[PDB]
Amino acid sequence: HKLARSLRSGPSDHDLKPNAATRDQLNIIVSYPPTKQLTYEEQDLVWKFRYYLTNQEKALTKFLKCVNWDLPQEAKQALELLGKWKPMDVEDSLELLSSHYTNPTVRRYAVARLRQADDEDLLMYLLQLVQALKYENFDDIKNGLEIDSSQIITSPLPEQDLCTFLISRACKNSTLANYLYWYVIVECEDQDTQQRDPKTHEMYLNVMRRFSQALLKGDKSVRVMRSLLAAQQTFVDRLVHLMKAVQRESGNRKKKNERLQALLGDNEKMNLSDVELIPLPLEPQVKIRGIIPETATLAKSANMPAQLFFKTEDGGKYPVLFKHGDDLRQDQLILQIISLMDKLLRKENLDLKLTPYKVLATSTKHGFLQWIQGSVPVAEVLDTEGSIQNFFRKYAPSENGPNGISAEVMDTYVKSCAGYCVITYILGVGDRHLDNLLLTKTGKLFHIDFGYILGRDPKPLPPPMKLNKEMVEGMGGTQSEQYQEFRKQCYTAFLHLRRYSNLILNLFSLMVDANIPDIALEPDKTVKKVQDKFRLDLSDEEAVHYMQSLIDESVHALF
Ligand SMILES: O=c1cc(N2CCOCC2)cc(N2CCC[C@@H]2Cc2ccccc2)[nH]1
């Protein structure tokens, strides 16, 4: 073993081609998932046929682990092969930016591959790419220059690495700028980072101050970007102050609610019912005129979230749920992954009427959730109308539609049930009950409150497919043509998502050092818990018959 890999071959068999039997062994090893550890035998094998593997872009990520970088004999040839290799897809490049690869060239190369991606894709990975800064050169991030984090943006002055790249893209795209601001603010406000990795806490302040510096340095349109972020930041700082002023001022919930409205209605002091048309950080397409004082209510629940109604640019209400005294990041992640999964299925022309509602932490302590206007907890739906079918008949009846319900509504309910069954199965969402399953009168089922994920549950053995009796009776029972449809969607959705397993797993790779509670328990064992739910051991034909039997053994058990 201890004889180095370039000491055992190279480049006198750059002329190698593997035989039929070996080509199978490689293709298995190459398209392994991206935290599946490789054995010394397999790392040796990948090195042996390294000149063959330069025509399989998939394989590049595997090869670079087998390089020993301390040996400059190895490292100089390895990086020569990195230029002769087929360039990898952006989907894959996220792997190179994780904790596992430390070589400057490898990481700059990854950024060059990212720079091929357009901002719509880049946004879907931005949360993870802010985590990826932790594995960057902290000295180089500092040396770009030319402390409360919430004051940086509001206090002006009278080969790209990852940090330089993200800032460059943010100054050219205001959507990225919005989310890059708030993601980095949370990493600064991360207190566990302040304690155990104070050097990392400094890096994110340096990232924020680097960003603000470019915004001020940039042209006329870019400088306005800075003042819009400053507007958001004080608005949130005022909103958080208004929350503290209620959370403290004692009395019951009804006295606190009267209090909440008093402070909102007072715009001289608190300055929240008539903002100057600023962009909502949650979704910056929505500019907000102010919070409506008279509708604002506090939820009868543990951390007292406030239900707030923003009056918008175009005369509408955009309701949100603002939590003070609660970590949102575990939700931020899940909704962010469900957003992708929704988009990946639509890539394949499968719209399953999913509800990936917006979530933005504006600190570790607090943040925003988009309220879906018209949603009701399935519990509440069962409680007042009796069944999921009675609900739909009352609110969307039809002479010819199935069970006296609009066919379009019944279709929506099926598809959403199917998608969320598969998606809550993969992500390992536990602690499901009828208060965290919501229903809409459009037909849409969806899930909220992701306090338990990646296997975790109050129960020791939860069921793997999160599907109850009431849900099945909403279709028409096990013999309806709806339930036939509901299976077909599940196995198809499961199949399509399997074909982006590599992407999803590379994303979860980046989230291990993010202090998300259900990931922090078993960070190394986190990514396998997702990987294993895809059942990559099976073929597509086998995966279908698996997903089928998953759904059947679950539904059989219910009756
Ligand atoms: O984590 C979430 C997300 C919620 N949303 C966001 C998506 O639209 C529906 C409401 C609501 C909640 N909560 C927490 C306090 C109570 C509320 C749950 C709720 C949902 C629907 C009607 C009444 C109450 N939590």
Curated annotation (Swiss-Prot):
Ubiquitously expressed, with a highest expression in skeletal muscle. It comes from the Eukaryota. Residues 298-304 are annotated as: G-loop. Residues 447-468 are annotated as: Activation loop. Its main location: other. Its cofactor is Mn(2+). The modification Phosphoserine is found at S12. It is found in: Midbody; Late endosome; Cytoplasmic vesicle, Autophagosome. Transmembrane segments: none annotated. GO terms for molecular function: 1-phosphatidylinositol-3-kinase activity; ATP binding; phosphatidylinositol kinase activity; protein kinase activity. It catalyses: a 1,2-diacyl-sn-glycero-3-phospho-(1D-myo-inositol) + ATP = a 1,2-diacyl-sn-glycero-3-phospho-(1D-myo-inositol-3-phosphate) + ADP + H(+). Its EC number is 2.7.1.137. Ubiquitinated via 'Lys-29'- and 'Lys-48'-linked ubiquitination by UBE3C, promoting its degradation. Deubiquitination by ZRANB1/TRABID promotes its stabilization, leading to autophagosome maturation. Keywords: ATP-binding, Autophagy, Cell cycle, Cell division, Cytoplasmic vesicle, Endosome, Kinase, Lipid metabolism, Manganese, Nucleotide-binding, Phosphoprotein, Transferase, Ubl conjugation. Residues 428-436 are annotated as: Catalytic loop. Catalytic subunit of the PI3K complex that mediates formation of phosphatidylinositol 3-phosphate; different complex forms are believed to play a role in multiple membrane trafficking pathways: PI3KC3-C1 is involved in initiation of autophagosomes and PI3KC3-C2 in maturation of autophagosomes and endocytosis. As part of PI3KC3-C1, promotes endoplasmic reticulum membrane curvature formation prior to vesicle budding. Involved in regulation of degradative endocytic trafficking and required for the abscission step in cytokinesis, probably in the context of PI3KC3-C2. (Microbial infection) Kinase activity is required for SARS coronavirus-2/SARS-CoV-2 replication. Component of the PI3K (PI3KC3/PI3K-III/class III phosphatidylinositol 3-kinase) complex the core of which is composed of the catalytic subunit PIK3C3, the regulatory subunit PIK3R4 and BECN1 associating with additional regulatory/auxiliary subunits to form alternative complex forms. Alternative complex forms containing a fourth regulatory subunit in a mutually exclusive manner are: the PI3K complex I (PI3KC3-C1) containing ATG14, and the PI3K complex II (PI3KC3-C2) containing UVRAG. This is Phosphatidylinositol 3-kinase catalytic subunit type 3. The gene is PIK3C3. The chain holds residues 271 to 871 of 887 of the full protein.
